[PDB]
Curated annotation (Swiss-Prot), chain B:
SUPFAM superfamilies: ARM repeat
Gene Ontology biological process terms, A to Z: proteasome-mediated ubiquitin-dependent protein catabolic process; regulation of protein catabolic process; ubiquitin-dependent protein catabolic process
Gene, per the UniProt record: RPN1
Biased composition (Low complexity): 179-191
Modified residues (Phosphoserine): S16, S19, S178, S187
Its job: Acts as a regulatory subunit of the 26S proteasome which is involved in the ATP-dependent degradation of ubiquitinated proteins.
Annotated Basic and acidic residues bias: 1-11, 24-34
One CC-aspect GO term: cytoplasm
PC repeat ranges per the UniProt record: 417-449, 450-487, 488-522, 523-563, 566-598, 714-745, 746-780
Region (Disordered): 1-44, 170-191
MF (Gene Ontology): enzyme regulator activity; protein-macromolecule adaptor activity
Protein name from the UniProt record: 26S proteasome regulatory subunit RPN1
Swiss-Prot record, chain C:
Name of this chain's protein: 26S proteasome regulatory subunit RPN2
UniProt PTM: N-acetylated by NAT1.
Residues of the full protein shown: 643 to 713 of 945
Signal peptide: none
Source species: Saccharomyces cerevisiae (strain ATCC 204508 / S288c)
Family the UniProt entry places it in: Belongs to the proteasome subunit S1 family.
From Swiss-Prot, chain D:
Compartments reported by the entry: Cytoplasm; Nucleus
Family: Belongs to the AAA ATPase family.
Record-given protein name: 26S proteasome regulatory subunit 4 homolog
Role according to the record: The 26S proteasome is involved in the ATP-dependent degradation of ubiquitinated proteins. The regulatory (or ATPase) complex confers ATP dependency and substrate specificity to the 26S complex. Has ATPase activity.
Length: 71, 906, 71, 49
């Protein structure tokens, strides 16, 4: 054992809550934005991959796994 | 209510309130047994329709619910909607309200959800028949009363809105989604939408947009043109049609991103062109900023009529109004080609006629001086600039200038700026050149340089029609190899022509602005001038400017001041465009350095403008980041960092400013406040950052055109007396100027208190003094707005030199720049063929009532005021024409526009 | 319960007692060693604990880490 | 309806974004001056009990 440090999480938490409340305020605008954005991605690519736009991710299967690591 | 059988027809209606006997038993049994009885049902359809109409008067939920309960079942349970194919299809007309009675009249959450989907499908199938349109129509124009129909008819309408929106968000679209179950397009619902639109335009104002924006296509808008242009005068007047149209762009103005927003505004322009008033056409054509649209309205009056008529005069007036001069250049030369008269036409288009009208206004306003009498040291320099600031626009103060005593006592950089200030006395005037000439041929090079700046300012009002252009004088000076001379020359050329990109002006500035290898601080003016020239019109995003910025960064980084001015110059250049500016953000970012990142945040504002709400959040995360990183630890570099921080603060403010002008119109109070708080984050996040944000606040307000002007500048001002940098006061006063001596008094007392009270540095004192004189023009001579005034959503091109200067700590060199402050607004006068210089009467209106406008089409009640008054600023801006009782008809509608009135008396 | 006792004087004793018991036992050999460790630091970092508490926390922490973790 | 919305468009966005700003900013006001201001707070506190 060990060493313990972290206090820059206190900063990080503060800017995380900020963006999230801003989106709700923003919503009215964002809804129109989604109209234009999505057709552009379809014809081209997501960014530089032809994946992870087939579904919500690229999988819809189970992800649960049990009895993993040491015992 | 209670059943009373078949005694009379009145009591038949009461009988069917509880249990129908001609819609429930009989019909149900009939459909489920014989199929010869399909012939009896067909006749009984008409009877059934009538019973609905009579009982539409009844509103109670219980006696529609239960009554039509077993009909609602029969759709799938007994009839199955295919036991006689055509016959249930055409009998869907009474059954469709039955479904709606469980949707809207009764609220049962399980059934209200489920039957929404069912309604969408059956609406689509029955609009093939075109009788689903008629079903909507009998409730839209009504026949009877109930609370019920007023909410119910929308439920039918909402089905259409639902699906069309969803096809964009979710790419799959059509009836593949089970949220409507109805196909998005196809010739069965498309014809339904067109017919629906017709009825709802007449009686409502409703589904006509939902369809446009949900289609996302300009095609939707171009269908709209057809129907409205019929309606233009016989159905209702021109005016009523217009309020729908300028609105077409405005409600979704702040929610059409660049490629969409332009494509829609093309269509509104075309609607106006089709209709009677070309006056409405010109306003929208200016908006787009495209050269092509301007030419079409100008051509439409000029070319078809051979005779001079009203038509040539009207063309010249329309193009004259923009004092950018973008319209001025284009419209000239057609007048020459046609050749009815050169002399009247060319002058009238140019800003030469605007010089003449100013003299008439000036006569009323007279001259009152209040300039500082201080002499010696820096106080001499302060006073001599102050004289020009009080006599902005055309003014006569010749004799004071001719007393060369105080002039010669200026020294250093003070000499240059002193000669420049003399030029602003004769701002917007042909005469004045004489005073400048004397100094220019004698003494040290310093006075020579200042003469060229003054020529720039004076030449603003005369540079068209090939009548003493700024180009003519200033070309010789560019040729001369001295840096001070050449730098001053090209600065003045940019100011005078403003937004005009004439061939001679542009092409002089084209090989140059491409040397930055040699280290010259005052070569900021190289790009700065060209940037100013570009605004007011669509931008090529010139390759000359982009190249030299990169080259400068390679060569030097010692002169911090130079690279900071350069960064701003790129961002100002790109103004007047936003579609193309998305591309160039990437191009700049290709080469990456921390120094280059400073340039990027500025250019992000312009690209994203009139769309900024992604931009807003970005310019706030940026602010947070320095500190956030320090946080992590808590648990050459000098130049790069400083450029980084300052750029961001400027960018934040700029984003907000451009956005608030174009957009909707309520929000203007709010955007000023976003600054106060940006400063507040700043008030305990960066100590250095506070210095920049103070200066930015004032130009935030001026650009944004805030409604409140009494409380907020004054309150902020008090805090900032304590805080360093007195240049804060200069930026506040440019907003406060308003209509003079309404707002601007409180500023004179407040700014005068801090200035007179505290002296502890003559350097500090100088900034404070200049600000005070700027604010007031004697007896409401002129007003300054950043906005065009022609559009209140507009933005100028002459006021961009004002906007530039608040990014840097105050400097004597900066004082030379600040003399320029052009941005004049003309006072309207009713014109005649003999060019009458008097307005008869006007209504002036502080606050538009109309909730059928933002801009406010001026009310017809108003408050009446006399002849020959300046077009009032905030709390006076809507202006209606009173001339109708003396029976005079405006040819050029004026809503509080810059534009001069013109009237026809018959 | 004696490390969250109502009286302070019991708390000094209790923390010291734990560390004497669990002097150099790893945290995959007694999970609660780490937890208890963290308590001690949490008291030391706080500046709104009693000076009786603070005194106990630091003494008890050094017993935990005693001898170079070799004793 | 579509005329009402133009007004409703500006009003929502601008003030609700300022609200979200002011909320975050309560913290932020302390951060640039925390040694004039907390220095002053200290001396204020000490004399008045």
């Amino acid at each position: 054992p060990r060493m313990y440090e972290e206090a820059s999480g206190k900063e990080v938490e503060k800017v995380a809550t900020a963006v999230l409340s801003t989106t709700a305020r923003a919503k009215a605008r964002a809804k129109k934005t989604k109209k234009e954005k999505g057709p552009n991605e379809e014809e081209k690519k997501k960014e530089h991959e032809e994946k992870e736009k087939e579904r919500e991710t690229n999988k819809k299967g189970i992800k649960e796994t049990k009895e993993n690591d040491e015992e | 209510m209670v059943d009373e059988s078949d005694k009379k027809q009145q009591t038949i209606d009461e009988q069917s309130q509880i249990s129908p006997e001609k819609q429930t038993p009989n019909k149900k049994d009939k459909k489920k047994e014989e199929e010869e009885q399909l012939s009896e049902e067909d006749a009984k359809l008409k009877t059934d329709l009538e019973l609905l109409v009579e009982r539409l008067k009844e509103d109670d939920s219980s006696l529609y619910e239960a009554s039509l309960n077993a009909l609602k079942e029969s759709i799938k349970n007994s009839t199955s909607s295919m036991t006689a194919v055509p016959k249930p299809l055409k009998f869907l007309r009474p059954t469709y309200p039955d479904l709606c009675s469980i949707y809207d009249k009764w609220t049962d959450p399980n059934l209200k959800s489920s039957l929404a989907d069912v309604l969408s499908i059956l609406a689509m199938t029955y609009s093939e028949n075109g009788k689903h349109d008629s079903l909507r129509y009998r409730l839209l124009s009504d026949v009877s009363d109930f609370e019920g129909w007023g909410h119910e008819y929308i439920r039918h309408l909402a089905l259409e809105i639902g699906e069309v929106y969803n096809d964009q968000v979710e790419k799959d679209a059509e009836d593949e989604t089970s949220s409507d179950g109805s196909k998005s397009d196809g010739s069965a619902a498309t014809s339904g939408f067109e017919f629906s639109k017709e009825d709802t335009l007449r009686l409502c104002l409703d589904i006509v947009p939902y369809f446009l924006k949900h289609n996302g296509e300009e095609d939707a808008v171009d269908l709209l043109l057809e129907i409205e242009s019929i309606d233009k005068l016989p159905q209702f007047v021109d005016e009523n049609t217009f309020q729908r149209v300028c609105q077409y762009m405005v409600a979704c103005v702040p929610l059409l991103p660049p490629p969409e927003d332009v494509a829609f505004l093309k269509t509104a322009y075309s609607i106006y062109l089709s209709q009677n008033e070309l006056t409405d056409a010109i306003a929208l054509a200016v908006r787009l900023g495209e050269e092509d649209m301007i030419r079409s309205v100008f051509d439409a009056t000029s070319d078809p009529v051979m005779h001079k008529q009203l038509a040539y005069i009207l063309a010249a007036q329309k193009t004259s109004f923009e004092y950018e001069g973008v319209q001025d250049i284009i419209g000239n030369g057609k007048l020459s080609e046609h050749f009815l008269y050169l002399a009247k036409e060319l002058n009238l288009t140019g800003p030469k006629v605007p010089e003449d009208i100013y003299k008439s206004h000036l006569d009323n306003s007279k001259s009152v001086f209040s300039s500082a009498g201080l002499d010696s040291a820096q106080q001499n320099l302060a006073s001599s600039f102050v004289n020009g600031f009080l006599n902005l626009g055309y003014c006569n103060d010749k004799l004071i200038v001719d007393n060369d005593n105080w002039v010669y006592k200026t020294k250093g950089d003070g000499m240059t700026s002193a000669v420049a200030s003399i030029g602003s006395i004769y701002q917007w005037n042909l005469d004045g050149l004489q005073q400048l000439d004397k100094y220019l041929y004698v003494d040290e090079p310093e006075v020579k340089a200042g003469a060229l700046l003054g020529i720039g300012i004076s030449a603003s009002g005369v540079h068209d029609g090939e009548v003493e252009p700024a180009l003519l004088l200033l070309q010789d000076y560019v040729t001369n190899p001295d840096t001070k001379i050449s730098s001053a020359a090209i600065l003045g050329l940019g100011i005078a022509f403003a937004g005009s990109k004439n061939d001679e002006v542009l092409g002089l500035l084209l090989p140059i602005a491409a040397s930055t290898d040699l280290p010259i601080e005052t070569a900021a003016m190289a790009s700065l001038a060209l940037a100013h020239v570009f605004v007011g019109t669509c931008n090529g995003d010139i390759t000359t400017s982009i190249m030299d910025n990169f080259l400068e960064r390679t060569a030097i980084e010692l002169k911090t001041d130079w690279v900071r001015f350069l960064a701003l110059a790129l961002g100002i250049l790109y103004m007047g465009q936003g579609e193309q500016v998305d591309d160039v953000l990437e191009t700049i970012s290709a080469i990456e350095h921390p120094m280059t990142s400073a340039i990027e945040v500025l250019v992000g504002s312009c690209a994203y403008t009139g769309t900024g709400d992604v931009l807003l959040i970005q310019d706030l995360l940026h602010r947070l980041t320095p500190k956030n990183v320090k946080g992590e630890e808590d648990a050459e570099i000098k130049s790069e960092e400083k450029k980084g921080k300052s750029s961001d603060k400027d960018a934040t403010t700029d984003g907000k400013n451009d956005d608030e002008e174009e957009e909707k119109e309520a929000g203007i109070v709010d955007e000023l406040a976003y600054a106060v708080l940006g400063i507040a984050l700043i008030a305990l996040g960066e100590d250095i950052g506070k210095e920049m944000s103070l200066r930015h606040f004032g130009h935030l307000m001026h650009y944004g055109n805030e409604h409140i002007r009494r409380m907020v500048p004054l309150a902020m001002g008090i805090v900032s007396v304590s805080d360093p940098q007195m240049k804060v006061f200069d930026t506040l006063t440019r907003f406060s100027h308003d209509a003079d001596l309404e707002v601007s008094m409180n500023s004179i007392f407040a700014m005068g208190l801090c200035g007179a009270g505290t002296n502890n540095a003559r350097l500090a004192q100088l900034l404070r003094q200049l600000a005070s004189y700027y604010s007031r023009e004697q007896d409401a001579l002129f007003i300054t707005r950043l906005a065009q005034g022609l559009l209140h959503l507009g933005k100028g091109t002459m006021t961009m030199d004002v906007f530039n200067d608040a990014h840097v700590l105050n400097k004597v060199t900066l004082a030379s720049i600040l003399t320029t402050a052009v941005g004049l607004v003309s006072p309207s006068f009713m014109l005649k063929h003999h060019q009458l210089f008097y307005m008869l009467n006007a209504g002036i209106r502080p606050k538009f009532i109309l909730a059928l406008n933002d801009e406010g089409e001026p009310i017809k009640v108003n408050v009446r005021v006399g002849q020959a008054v300046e077009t009032v600023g905030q709390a006076g801006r809507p202006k209606k024409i009173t001339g109708w009782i003396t029976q005079s008809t405006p040819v050029l509608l004026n809503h509080g526009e810059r534009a001069e009135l013109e009237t026809d008396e018959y | 319960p004696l490390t969250k006792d109502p009286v302070d004087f019991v708390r000094q004793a209790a923390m010291i007692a734990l560390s004497m018991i669990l002097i150099q036992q790893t945290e995959k050999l007694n999970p609660q060693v780490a937890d208890i460790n963290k308590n001690f630091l949490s008291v030391i970092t706080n500046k709104h604990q009693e000076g009786l508490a603070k005194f106990g926390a630091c003494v008890a922490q050094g017993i935990m880490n005693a001898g170079g973790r070799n004793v | 309806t579509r005329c009402k919305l133009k007004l409703l468009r500006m009003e929502r966005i601008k003030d609700h974004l300022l609200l979200e700003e002011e909320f975050v900013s309560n913290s932020e006001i302390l951060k640039p001056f925390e040694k004039k201001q907390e220095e002053e707070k200290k001396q204020l506190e000490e004399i008045r009990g």
